[PDB]
Amino acid sequence: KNIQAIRGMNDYLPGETAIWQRIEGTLKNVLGSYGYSEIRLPIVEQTPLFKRAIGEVTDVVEKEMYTFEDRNGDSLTLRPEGTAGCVRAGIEHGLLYNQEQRLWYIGPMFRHERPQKGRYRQFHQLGCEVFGLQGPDIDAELIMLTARWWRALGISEHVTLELNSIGSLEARANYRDALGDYLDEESREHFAGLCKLLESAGIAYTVNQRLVRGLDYYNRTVFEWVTNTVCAGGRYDGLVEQLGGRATPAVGFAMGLERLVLLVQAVNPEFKADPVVDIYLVASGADTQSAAMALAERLRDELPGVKLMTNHGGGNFKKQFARADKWGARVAVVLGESEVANGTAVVKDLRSGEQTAVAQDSVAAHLRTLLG
Amino acid sequence: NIQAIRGMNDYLPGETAIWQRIEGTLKNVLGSYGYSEIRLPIVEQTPLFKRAIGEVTDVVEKEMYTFEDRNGDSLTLRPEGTAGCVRAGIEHGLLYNQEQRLWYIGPMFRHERPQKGRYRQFHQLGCEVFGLQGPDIDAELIMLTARWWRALGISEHVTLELNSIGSLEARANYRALGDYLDEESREHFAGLCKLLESAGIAYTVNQRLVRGLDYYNRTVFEWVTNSLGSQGTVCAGGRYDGLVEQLGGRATPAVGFAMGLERLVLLVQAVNPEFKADPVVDIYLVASGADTQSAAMALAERLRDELPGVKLMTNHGGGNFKKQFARADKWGARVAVVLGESEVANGTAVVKDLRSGEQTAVAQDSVAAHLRTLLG
Numbered sequence: 202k203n204i205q206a207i208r209g210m211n212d213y214l215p216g217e218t219a220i221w222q223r224i225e226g227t228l229k230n231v232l233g234s235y236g237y238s239e240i241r242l243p244i245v246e247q248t249p250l251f252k253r254a255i256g257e258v259t260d261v262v263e264k265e266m267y268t269f270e271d272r273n274g275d276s277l278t279l280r281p282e283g284t285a286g287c288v289r290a291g292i293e294h295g296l297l298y299n300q301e302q303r304l305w306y307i308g309p310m311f312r313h314e315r316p317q318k319g320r321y322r323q324f325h326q327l328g329c330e331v332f333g334l335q336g337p338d339i340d341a342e343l344i345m346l347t348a349r350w351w352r353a354l355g356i357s358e359h360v361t362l363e364l365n366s367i368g369s370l371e372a373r374a375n376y377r378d379a380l381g382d383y384l385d386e387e388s389r390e391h392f393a394g395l396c397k398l399l400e401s402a403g404i405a406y407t408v409n410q411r412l413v414r415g416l417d418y419y420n421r422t423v424f425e426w427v428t429n430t431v432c433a434g435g436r437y438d439g440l441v442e443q444l445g446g447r448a449t450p451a452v453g454f455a456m457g458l459e460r461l462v463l464l465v466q467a468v469n470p471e472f473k474a475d476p477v478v479d480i481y482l483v484a485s486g487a488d489t490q491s492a493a494m495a496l497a498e499r500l501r502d503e504l505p506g507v508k509l510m511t512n513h514g515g516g517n518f519k520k521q522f523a524r525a526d527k528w529g530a531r532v533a534v535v536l537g538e539s540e541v542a543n544g545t546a547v548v549k550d551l552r553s554g555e556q557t558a559v560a561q562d563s564v565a566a567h568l569r570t571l572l573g
Numbered sequence: 574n575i576q577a578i579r580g581m582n583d584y585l586p587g588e589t590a591i592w593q594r595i596e597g598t599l600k601n602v603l604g605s606y607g608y609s610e611i612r613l614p615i616v617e618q619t620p621l622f623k624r625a626i627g628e629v630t631d632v633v634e635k636e637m638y639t640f641e642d643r644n645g646d647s648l649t650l651r652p653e654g655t656a657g658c659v660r661a662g663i664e665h666g667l668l669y670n671q672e673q674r675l676w677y678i679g680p681m682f683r684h685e686r687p688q689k690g691r692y693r694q695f696h697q698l699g700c701e702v703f704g705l706q707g708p709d710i711d712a713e714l715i716m717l718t719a720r721w722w723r724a725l726g727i728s729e730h731v732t733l734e735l736n737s738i739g740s741l742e743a744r745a746n747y748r749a750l751g752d753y754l755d756e757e758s759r760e761h762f763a764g765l766c767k768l769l770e771s772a773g774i775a776y777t778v779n780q781r782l783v784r785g786l787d788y789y790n791r792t793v794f795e796w797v798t799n800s801l802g803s804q805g806t807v808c809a810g811g812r813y814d815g816l817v818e819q820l821g822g823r824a825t826p827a828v829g830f831a832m833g834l835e836r837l838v839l840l841v842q843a844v845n846p847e848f849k850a851d852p853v854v855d856i857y858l859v860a861s862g863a864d865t866q867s868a869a870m871a872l873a874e875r876l877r878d879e880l881p882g883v884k885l886m887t888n889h890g891g892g893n894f895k896k897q898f899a900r901a902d903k904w905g906a907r908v909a910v911v912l913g914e915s916e917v918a919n920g921t922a923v924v925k926d927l928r929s930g931e932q933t934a935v936a937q938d939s940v941a942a943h944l945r946t947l948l949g
């Protein structure tokens with residue numbers, strides 16, 4: 202009998218997916234308005250990668266990764282994040298040697314934590330990474346980018362930014378005794394210069410020294426966007442080197458798409474996506490089959506952009522209209538034996554009930570006016 | 574230093590852009606048929622695959638990435654998408670006495686020998702329809718794929734191969750198959766062929782057509798290319814009327830197929846050697862001087878709102894105008910809005926058309942309309 206989805210791994214069913222589609226689109230759209238490019242990386246990578254780049258002491262590598270041994274005996278790990286993955290493909294394809302790269306990625310991520318409301322074992326991130334820029338200016342842009350999404354999505358009133366700086370090794374290996382006190386000048390310099398750009402931008406922030414990231418590749422800048430946390434990231438200038446490439450500056454962040462989606466469904470409880478169906482093609486009688494399907498393609502060639510589902514497996518009219526209704530069809534094009542003969546097809550506005558027989562070469566324009 | 578696991582690709586910026594355009598077209602076609610996207614897990618319990626696909630098949634026999642969870646459970650990186658789509662249709666009761674016209678896109682894993690169209694991590698775009706028995710839906714799926722070929726401009730480079738493998742029984746008593754198909758099966762197939770003709774879809778009935786999975790019945794098909802080595806079949810599928818029941822759900826007919834995206838891209842790129850992607854950058858914001866920073870940034874935030882759809886990258890990391898106009902040409906920007914010390918103070922910005930090279934100082938308010946006139 203029945204197999205169940207592994208615990209901590211979800212099935213975004215149709216209805217859910219429509220919402221995701223809309224949000225993902227807005228996000229991607231904004232990412233494009235800023236000049237960024239999409240990059241795609243593998244789901245699995247050699248375990249050393251997350252051992253090295255993320256650390257051996259991290260709760261992630263220690264007790265959270267999905268590692269297994271390939272048939273050839275190599276330790277493999279299901280990516281718990283993509284920053285490591287990116288740098289890796291970055292160094293390997295030589296796109297970071299004295300080059301600027303503003304990239305983004307979207308896809309699943311894996312970690313064996315325990316299932317919560319906002320925590321899942323296969324979860325999804327939308328992340329950004331930039332290589333080649335040092336100054337706090339670029340750090341500002343990223344935050345501004347996230348800022349624009351909140352606006353775009355309508356959740357600015359429910360997302361707070363929290364900053365912080367952590368200089369480097371010395372700033373810590375000297376701050377052993379016991380608040381970013383040490384932090385050499387260029388660090389309070391770079392953080393101050395970023396805290397300023399952030400103001401001139403009217404972006405409301407809240408510094409906090411008790412803000413730590415569970416990943417050990419961050420240096421200077423470090424932030425988290427929290428809800429009344431959906432996004433987080435920071436700098437990592439030495440990582441490109443610490444993995445075998447010519448050291449170059451870099452900053453990035455990644456957002457939890459399940460958190461973002463749930464938040465967007467909380468703040469705008471009405472947020473709806475387009476129906477999956479605009480036009481339902483009703484048909485009855487014997488041998489209306491090829492006709493209905495032919496009419497369907499025809500209207501498809503004439504109306505790309507409209508969603509038209511063709512009814513199959515018969516059913517009486519009452520049913521077909523119920524089905525058209527089930528999908529959110531705003532209009533139904535009826536093709537019976539008559540219509541077939543008359544070269545017409547009835548066009549019923551499901552909204553207003555009014556129907557009307559139309560010359561086939563005419564329905565396209567008719568529908569165009571109905572669907573407005 | 575580390576490298577990518579063999580058989581597992583990285584799609585860099587340039588490439589990524591072609592895939593987005595191709596996927597857009599593919600999704601648009603899917604919506605024009607009123608189908609809905611579903612998203613299922615990368616990992617599943619090993620038995621789901623052993624049971625659905627079959628133990629005598631090569632996938633399960635020698636191709637699955639199976640490993641152990643932190644509690645002993647057997648886990649498996651999905652080698653395909655159908656089992657999981659059915660496993661979820663039953664778990665959430667989406668199939669019981671219902672019609673669903675689904676589609677999914679994502680990675681799949683098969684430990685095969687890397688080659689041209691075969692990778693250990695590849696990507697599929699599949700369709701699965703539940704509740705429609707008759708051949709009419711079979712026909713629809715095929716037309717849909719034909720609409721794709723049309724939209725991508727590759728009809729000429731892709732041919733269709735059909736075949737019906739009758740029922741379990743029909744196959745059991747087969748120890749040429751057509752001679753054993755049941756009456757209902759051969760009738761169903763004829764209905765599909767007549768339907769494919771009535772719509773001019775050219776096909777070739779290949780009686781030695783075998784799918785690598787054990788869950789097919791009746792309809793079975795493939796779309797093969799040129800005759801490319803051993804990776805010429807671009808999209809394949811068939812009917813599986815008894816899989817839902819077998820996996821523990823209530824019996825319902827089902828038909829589907831999956832396309833290997835890497836193969837599609839390759840083909841599209843071969844047939845249309847110039848297929849392109851709009852530059853990643855339209856307007857590059859040059860700027861130089863004392864604190865022109867927080868200014869250029871804001872001007873960009875502003876121009877974004879006013880010019881939706883346009884792509885605007887703000888230059889960062891200083892640089893003299895030489896370096897920046899270069900960084901502009903690099904990203905393929907067609908225009909640049911320059912913001913020096915003057916313009917800031919005077920509330921203007923220079924709009925340098927990169928194609929011609931000429932510029933003109935424009936009041937910040939009117940620049941949005943100015944740009945918009947150049948970008949078409």
Ligand SMILES: Nc1ncnc2c1ncn2[C@@H]1O[C@H](COS(=O)(=O)NC(=O)[C@@H](N)Cc2cnc[nH]2)[C@@H](O)[C@H]1O
Pocket residue numbers: 282283284312314319320321322324325326328329330415416430431432433434435437452453454455456457458459460
């Ligand atoms: N189990 C989970 N369920 C759901 N959502 C989760 C889960 N685990 C994490 N996330 C999301 O991941 C987001 C970012 O945090 S983070 O993953 O720890 N940081 C990173 O992944 C870094 N790679 C970000 C970065 C990129 N480049 C530089 N820095 C969190 O805010 C969560 O939303």
Ligand SMILES: Nc1ncnc2c1ncn2[C@@H]1O[C@H](COS(=O)(=O)NC(=O)[C@@H](N)Cc2cnc[nH]2)[C@@H](O)[C@H]1O
Pocket residue numbers: 652653654655683685690691692693694695696697699700701785806807808809810811812813828829830831832833834835836
């Ligand atoms: N390792 C690879 N690298 C790259 N591309 C590959 C690779 N393995 C396969 N493909 C592609 O995936 C396609 C479909 O795979 S199949 O195994 O042939 N069919 C299935 O997977 C069924 N789930 C389809 C179906 C859906 N509903 C009913 N049937 C192949 O035709 C190839 O195009």
